[PDB]
């Protein structure tokens, strides 16, 4: 029980570190699917 209390304290510290990492948004590009469609159109046009 003491060992698991120490482990859960470490997990809480890891959760706080995870929240600090989550503070950095690292948002995916808003137009990834749009860029994929644009390159698909470009490759189709290039092959045509």
């Amino acid at each position: 029980t003491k060992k698991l209390q120490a482990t859960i304290i470490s997990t809480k510290e890891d959760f706080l570190r995870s929240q600090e990492i989550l503070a950095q948004t690292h948002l995916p590009e808003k137009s990834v699917f749009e860029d994929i469609d644009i390159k698909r159109k470009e490759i189709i046009n290039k092959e045509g």
Binding site: T1, Q5, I8, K12
Partner: protein
């Protein structure tokens, strides 16, 4: 270095030797129960605090 010495504690005035002392289980039982209670309260408070988070 002294055959007999006055009791350091108050409420009594007498001189005793080393052989007069005998084992007292009451004091050790009190110490053991105090240690168990402090350990259990610390474990419970830590567990409750972690459960809150």
């Amino acid at each position: 270095g002294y055959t007999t010495r006055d009791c350091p504690q108050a409420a009594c005035s007498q001189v005793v030797s080393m052989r007069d002392f005998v084992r007292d289980p009451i004091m050790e039982l009190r110490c053991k129960i105090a240690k168990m209670k402090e350990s259990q309260e610390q474990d419970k408070r830590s567990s409750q605090a972690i459960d809150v988070l």
